[PDB]
Symmetry: C2
Subunit: 311 residues, 2 copies
């Protein structure tokens, strides 16, 4: 039945989801936000960047490294959403619209880690050797239910749109307008992605409320949890205001509203147990917001000095 639900969605994925892609022709590329290496001005542009970035506080460097590590892990996030599927009909073989979306979306995502990685490299502010190791360990690390991937990615796209957006805003506040542009441009990609993925989940709730509710309850319980090295990234994002416990709870309420999870009808006893669990979470998580803030305020970079580069 899940396979068939997915199959029956092809037309709507084509009509409603694929338009959320931005044409490659109209798309920014990392080179847009970097010193021009073909230009006689290259060295001077690189120097300006390094000057601009010497003004950035340490917390900010760390959050930005957090964001790049997350993005650079792209090969291990698109893998769940990869569907070994291809449709046969009178026009011949073609790719399922699900795969057309995943592939093009992966191509979008690929630019996010590259821009931040080359920008941080050029700044000199972080030790790119240690961070590349981290990333190799992380790709090396990398339940089969096919709704789960879609739900998780909805949440992740909204969280990452908000985090990159807030990083951008703080870069702007410090006068680092190129870094603000980078962070803001990524955020705008993520806002589109979040829109496509939320709509997919919406549609799954429409067509299979029982399956989707059980999957969402599983995801909230098991996978998607309130927002040592990753703990440290998390603490820094908390105290900077980029991505907080309050924002996590706010994302949960938005998703509950957007998908009308507290308004589902016709559920079994099992479905209602799952709906009750999910819908009761925001009240549970409000209570731990003020503790998240205190904990973040005590974090030291001393165990993490290895992240930093030139001062």
């Amino acid at each position: 039945e899940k396979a068939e639900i997915f199959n029956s969605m092809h037309g709507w994925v084509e009509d409603t989801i694929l338009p959320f892609l931005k044409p490659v022709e109209e798309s920014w590329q990392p080179t847009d936000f970097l010193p021009d290496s073909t230009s006689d001005g290259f060295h001077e542009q690189v120097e300006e960047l390094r000057k601009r970035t010497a003004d950035l506080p340490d917390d900010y460097l760390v959050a930005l490294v957090g964001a790049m590590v997350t993005e650079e892990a792209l090969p291990t996030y698109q893998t769940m959403l990869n569907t070994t599927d291809v449709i046969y009909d009178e026009s011949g073989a073609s790719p399922v619209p699900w795969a057309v979306w995943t592939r093009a979306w992966t191509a979008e995502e690929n630019r996010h880690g590259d821009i931040v990685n080359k920008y941080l490299y050029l700044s000199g502010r972080v030790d790119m050797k240690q961070i590349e190791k981290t990333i190799q360990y992380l790709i090396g690390s990398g339940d089969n239910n096919p709704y789960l991937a879609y739900i998780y990615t909805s949440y992740q796209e909204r969280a990452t749109a908000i985090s990159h957006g807030s990083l951008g805003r703080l870069a702007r506040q410090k006068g680092e307008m190129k870094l603000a542009q980078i962070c803001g441009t990524i955020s705008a990609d993520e806002k589109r992605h979040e829109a496509a993925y939320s709509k997919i989940v919406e549609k799954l709730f429409e067509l299979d409320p029982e399956g989707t509710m059980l999957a969402l309850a599983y995801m909230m319980k098991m996978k998607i949890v309130m927002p040592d090295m990753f703990q440290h990234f998390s603490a820094v994002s908390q105290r900077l205001g980029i991505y907080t416990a309050k924002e996590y709870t706010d994302i949960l309420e938005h998703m509950i509203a957007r998908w009308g999870v507290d308004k589902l009808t016709g559920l079994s006893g099992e479905g209602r147990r799952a709906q009750d669990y999910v819908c009761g979470l925001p009240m549970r998580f409000r209570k731990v917001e003020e503790r998240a803030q205190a904990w973040a305020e005590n974090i030291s970079h001393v165990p993490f000095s290895w992240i930093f580069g030139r001062r």
Copy 2:
């Protein structure tokens, strides 16, 4: 039966394939082969690179762009080999050794496109904006039989080990010792990868000669073919001697020998038709080697001037 063949191989994959991984601790990283951005010497090192790279012929620039485009497409090559599999036993849940290999191998591969991409960027010799577009189109483009991926990757790892190795050798010949090191270091990764993948195919031939032969015949016929923009990369690799029609044929003979495809026994009529087809290919491809060379010698960069950066 293919699923079961794969399942029955877990112990041997663990004992024989996983040791071909290089520990992340002992591993090079892109930063190793790049100007040190944390150093007061950064600008000077970047200048040395740009000087070293001004000595590189155009054919060489193009082949190197070919290689990076190929590598940077990594998200669309690991996807077939991704297996949504996880083993349950008395120790709990664990990852199938197939997935442990794929993940760690993907983490290895991720460094290949990054090093070449940042090196080419810093050189100024190519227009990275146009090449990033190309790459986005290419990831966006990106039969389900599970032997096919393993066979294809065997061939691809041997081809890419030979191509990066020969690019390295030519960089060396021009005195560009850092670029030679990069190309040579990648080649050595690919030689390990090729060894792991050839051994997998070997084992598939041992355990299921009939299935593997039919898959190999399919791959030679359909997918793996004698070595406009990709045609142009191919022509340049031909005339430079980096990767030629003769080398393609040589890879086919090596694989036939390594896996003893001309020595399989107990095949059905169908199996023997497939074995005869494959084993007759090298004689067929020798005949078109001298034509590949002539064709490559007539290629113009004029339609491809968009690749180039500063002169």
